[PDB]
Design a protein around this ligand. Sequence first.
Ligand SMILES: Nc1ncnc2c1ncn2[C@@H]1O[C@H](COP(=O)(O)OP(=O)(O)OP(=O)(O)O)[C@@H](O)[C@H]1O
Ligand SMILES: Nc1ncnc2c1ncn2[C@@H]1O[C@H](COP(=O)(O)OP(=O)(O)OP(=O)(O)O)[C@@H](O)[C@H]1O
Ligand SMILES: [Mg+2]
Ligand SMILES: [Mg+2]
Lengths: 247, 247
Amino acid sequence: SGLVPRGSHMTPDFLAIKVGGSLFSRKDEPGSLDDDAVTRFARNFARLAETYRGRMVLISGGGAFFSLAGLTEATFEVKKRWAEKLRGIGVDAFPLQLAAMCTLRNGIPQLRSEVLRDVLDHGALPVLAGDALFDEHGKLWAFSSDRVPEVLLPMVEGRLRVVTLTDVDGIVTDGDTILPEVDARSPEQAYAALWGAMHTKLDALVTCARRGAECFIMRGDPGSDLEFLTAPFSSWPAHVRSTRITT
Amino acid sequence: SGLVPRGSHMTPDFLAIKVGGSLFSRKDEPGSLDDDAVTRFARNFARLAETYRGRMVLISGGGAFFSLAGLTEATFEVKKRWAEKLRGIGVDAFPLQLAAMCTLRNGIPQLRSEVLRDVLDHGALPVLAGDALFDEHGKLWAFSSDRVPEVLLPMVEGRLRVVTLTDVDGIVTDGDTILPEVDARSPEQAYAALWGAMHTKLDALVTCARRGAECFIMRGDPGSDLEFLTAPFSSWPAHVRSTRITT
Ligand SMILES: Nc1ncnc2c1ncn2[C@@H]1O[C@H](COP(=O)(O)OP(=O)(O)OP(=O)(O)O)[C@@H](O)[C@H]1O
Ligand SMILES: Nc1ncnc2c1ncn2[C@@H]1O[C@H](COP(=O)(O)OP(=O)(O)OP(=O)(O)O)[C@@H](O)[C@H]1O
Ligand SMILES: [Mg+2]
Ligand SMILES: [Mg+2]
């Protein structure tokens, strides 16, 4: 309910990192992950998981969509692949089926967060992903991985940082240039820049920013060190590109 | 809270069918299902699912066990295999990760049943299995597939029938003979007959019977027609063997 100190000079209290499916899945084989990419990412996420032990979730994109029962199985498989890889390197990773613990009411996800808190409360790493969710009149919908950070909003106290890793440096305006900053209260310019994919990321991150989260769209790379994600924005290395979305 | 009419001449209101892993998994390859067996069972379960649409759960045994994060993935895979097969023949089957929707409090599972009811409420078939569950002090335990019917007890109104299909005709007393009936209020003779596997089934089914369920241990066979499971016990075909556990 209360006043949370926020700013570019403050350390985040919780990290939700979303890795886009385009970064670890082969076009050259649809349905197929690139094990090298998953392995190298996993190593960089493990470092973050150890610093943010009990204060981080990993959200995977990817996994091919009542025929949406298939979707829940496809996204479970992706969670399993990340969780397995992470555990192979010493990280206590537990995959959770969002469909079993979250429904939609008037379009807003309602997480029954007891298990998620349990995994966190005792210092493990929840591995999440998009899913098929039921709503209040009992219908099933496809809920994108990009929107999964929204589920954390009621639960996370303090400063939530959401990072969505994708295959572009940020929101580009045309093209010549990226938008370094978006005010979630008036994000017209950002929507106007889009050519849906990036639209879904933007809606999701504006929603989270309205509830106080510091959000980023930036480029992921399996090899890239991500430790700066634990640090105040003001202390980030020079020449990191991102679109930062805050209120 | 109220008086439920029960008896050998009454039709069940809800079916929980548990299929033992020994019935559809190869010894000759551990971790490996027998697709023929799953296919033929699925056909017999589909018939029941259509009659008990919205009034049945399928519980799978099988799937090899913080290293119990592996267990939740192993049992998810088994659920997926059943769900996929069932959907291939017209049944609206949705697999649910028990670990995401159920914790232990003082050893008793506490199901957050909203999603399970949603899958049921709108006439689909939940596919369940054993799992790793967290408890109230946040520890993870292996929760056998045999105990999964216990999770339904608070939720199911009316007459619950639990059927556990295994590789024996019932509880054999030595050996020459099976116990056709066990009174759950005084099941000494049944425990005394056991030589744990069958012990876990018996504890689980005595617990459910104490809460009014009509429970059975009987032999499963991929080919066997199971329609009599929709019918009052008194009308079952002659020479069906089972151990029936009631209060
Ligand atoms: N203004 C814009 N700036 C940057 N990208 C944009 C813009 N408008 C549209 N896009 C598109 O959005 C894409 C990024 O979103 P996309 O949904 O394709 O990938 P991803 O979500 O990271 O991976 P996944 O969808 O597999 O989880 C870019 O590759 C780009 O083609
Ligand atoms: N009195 C008894 N009557 C019958 N079976 C008994 C008795 N005592 C012990 N058992 C053993 O219990 C076994 C059945 O339980 P078991 O756990 O092995 O299989 P299942 O549970 O159906 O398959 P899964 O364990 O793969 O889910 C029998 O095969 C038998 O060896
Ligand atoms: Mg996308
Ligand atoms: Mg057993």
